[PDB]
């Protein structure tokens, strides 16, 4: 149904170790499709999914040039950020950017994004209106003033409503075998005695795509949030993801617990129990 495209920039200064490293990765949903790294032997935008390989040489030259220009732009941004925060040239600092668009089943824009962070803290963000900015502090307010003067938001809006959604629609069609296939979780509950009267029940979800999933334990039909150990969803390395949720239960009470699984590849949410 719904889909997203996102580009992520990371620009990291490293005084004494050359110019700041600039990396760009692009995703459609939870699928990496392009990368650029300024430390690469001959830096270029490179394909990372089969369906982007059919874009012609002109695409790759244009995309590479955008990245080459942005490595310079973001190196300048790093220097500017030092001034704005009255910082020494001694330390390593990081600017990040994430921008892109979400589209619905009909491929219309649901919303656009363009936001930056400095040293892991929000710096500036294009508002959902795609016409105004939210600056995090008085430093970012200087940037806001410059972007207001140069009508950057209008230019971002044109991109988000145009090329962003248009290119994503093309990617979704070219990659329809994978990007438009949801792989449901393979689920099971394992049982591990901790001590005489304590047992760990672990609910597994494996082999699923996209990454979004909900795993919850209930005891007598009531959610056990504060008693549930929930690991972060993690990549398998084969495009798919894994997750588990665990509860510690009194021996003999295993059947009072039920694991609940929600995923877009499942027609209805699943209920699992430990199966002796």
């Amino acid at each position: 149904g719904s889909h997203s495209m996102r580009y992520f920039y990371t620009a990291m200064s490293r005084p004494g170790r050359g110019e700041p490293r600039f990396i760009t990765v692009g995703y459609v949903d939870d699928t990496l499709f392009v990368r650029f790294d300024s430390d690469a032997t001959s830096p270029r935008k490179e394909p990372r999914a089969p369906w982007i390989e059919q874009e012609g040489p002109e695409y790759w030259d244009r995309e590479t040039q955008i990245s080459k220009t942005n490595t310079q732009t973001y190196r300048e941004n790093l220097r500017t950020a030092l001034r704005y925060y009255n910082q020494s040239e001694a330390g390593s600092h990081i600017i990040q950017r994430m921008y892109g668009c979400d589209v619905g089943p009909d491929g219309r824009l649901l919303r656009g994004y363009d936001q930056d962070a400095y040293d892991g803290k929000d710096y500036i963000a294009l508002n959902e209106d795609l016409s105004s900015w939210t600056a995090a502090d008085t430093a970012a307010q200087i940037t806001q003033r410059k972007w207001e003067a140069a009508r950057v938001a209008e230019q971002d809006r044109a991109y988000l409503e145009g090329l962003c959604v248009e290119s994503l629609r093309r990617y979704l069609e070219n990659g329809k075998e994978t990007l438009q296939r949801a792989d449901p979780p393979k689920t099971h509950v394992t049982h591990h005695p901790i001590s005489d009267h304590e047992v760990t029940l672990r609910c597994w979800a494996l082999g699923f795509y996209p990454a979004e999933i909900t795993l919850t334990w209930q005891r007598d039909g009531e959610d056990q949030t504060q008693d549930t150990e929930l690991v972060e969803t993690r990549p398998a390395g084969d495009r798919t993801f894994q997750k588990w949720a665990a509860v510690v239960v009194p021996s003999g009470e295993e059947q009072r617990y039920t694991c609940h699984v929600q995923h877009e590849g499942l027609p209805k949410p699943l209920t699992l129990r430990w199966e002796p």
Partner: peptide, 10 residues
């Protein structure tokens, strides 16, 4: 495809 808006500076 990326936004090719060039001259945006902090």
């Amino acid at each position: 495809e990326e936004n090719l808006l060039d001259f945006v500076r902090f």
